[PDB]
Amino acid sequence: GHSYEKYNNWETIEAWTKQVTSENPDLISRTAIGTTFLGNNIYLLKVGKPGPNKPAIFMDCGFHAREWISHAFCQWFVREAVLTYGYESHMTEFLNKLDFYVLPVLNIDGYIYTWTKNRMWRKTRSTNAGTTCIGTDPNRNFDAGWCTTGASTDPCDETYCGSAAESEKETKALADFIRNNLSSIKAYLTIHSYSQMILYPYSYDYKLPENNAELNNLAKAAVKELATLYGTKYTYGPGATTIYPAAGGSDDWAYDQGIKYSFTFELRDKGRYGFILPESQIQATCEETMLAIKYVTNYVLGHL
Ligand SMILES: [Zn+2]
Ligand SMILES: [Zn+2]
Ligand SMILES: [Zn+2]
Ligand SMILES: [Zn+2]
Ligand SMILES: [Zn+2]
Ligand SMILES: [Zn+2]
Ligand SMILES: [Zn+2]
Structure with missing residues (x-):
């Protein structure tokens, strides 16, 4: 009983990954890049028309x-790609010329827990030595200024950095796939959500990427494009001064591997509903975010 305009549980999203692949075999393939702490397959969709030497x-x-609006967004992105391929010139050119690896839910165990026990859970569901407190913050678990600022060393805290960089099965699987x-x-x-931001490196220190001007300009234009649809206002900039310093983030890590266009999106809202954004806002949030994502995609494609 999947819908793009509601929040779907893990059983539903997992079945949707299978069915959307089966329904669109010329555009979508599915693999598992690893398993979670609890042993759930971490699915990944490769969305694109096959072709030689395609960038991704x-x-x-x-x-x-x-x-939950983040998980809803990756499903909406796939929705748009299959719906509009052939009809919208830009999305069609994107899928012909590049592949999109879309990982709909990284922290599946935490996601299941928000549906079964505790809506406001953040972290993974792995155990920690020496305590009964559960979980690591996956966006503090990457090898990028690991555990130095804006991350906690206490396993009982919501930004706990883990026992070592890539200690979590999930972040190890994502880092391995990217490497x-x-x-x-x-x-x-x-x-991510919430707060209406487009962030780029760095968050782990007050320092700026080699291509800061290019990123700043790109984030600025992407926020402008997003606002065209409903007037929604986003801020943008380097993470440490735009939202707060935070070490061990996946975007900083990816950028340090040489991936020059590295962005975190914090979607709606600005705190009225915060994480409990109602289902009635899924459509508007996803459609306006599609504009920014397609802007960024167009830029990347034009500047290879
Ligand atoms: Zn569906
Ligand atoms: Zn169907
Ligand atoms: Zn399963
Ligand atoms: Zn073109
Ligand atoms: Zn987040
Ligand atoms: Zn957030
Ligand atoms: Zn649409």
Whole structure:
């Protein structure tokens, strides 16, 4: 009983990954890149018309269990690609010329827990030595200024950095996939909520990427494009001064591997509903975010 305009549980999204692949075999393939702490397959969709030597854009959602609009977004992106391929010139050119690796839910165990026990859960569901407190913050678990600022060393805290960089099965699987595909992957996009921001490196220190002007200009134009649809206002800039310093983030790590276009999206809203954004806003949030994602995709494609 899947719908793009409601929040779907993991059983439903998993079945949707299978069915959307089966329904669109010329555009979609599915693999598992690893398993979670609890042993769930971490699915990944490769969305694109087959072709030789294609560059790729990588996008994940659901790092943080309670940010349900993020998981809804990766499904909407796939929805748009299959619906509009052949009809909308830009999306058709994108899928012909590049592949999108779309990882609909990274932290599946945390996501299941938000549906079964605790809506506001954030972290993974792995155990920690020496305590009964559960979970690591996956966006503090990457090898990027690991565990130095804006991350906690206490396993009982919501930004706990873990026992070591890539200690979590899930972040190890994502980092391994990106390392193994680094020559093809030209951009990295990671979808969170909330607060209406487009962020780029760096978050782990107050320092700026070599191509800061190019990123700043791109984030500025992407926010402008997003606002065209409903007037929704986003801010943008380097993470440490745009939202807060935070070490161990996947976007900073990906950028440090050489992926020059690396962005975090924090979708709606600005706190009225916060993480419990109602289903009635799924459509408007996804459609306007599609504009920014297609803007960024067009830029990447035009500047290879
Ligand atoms: Zn459906
Ligand atoms: Zn169907
Ligand atoms: Zn299953
Ligand atoms: Zn063109
Ligand atoms: Zn988040
Ligand atoms: Zn957030
Ligand atoms: Zn649409």
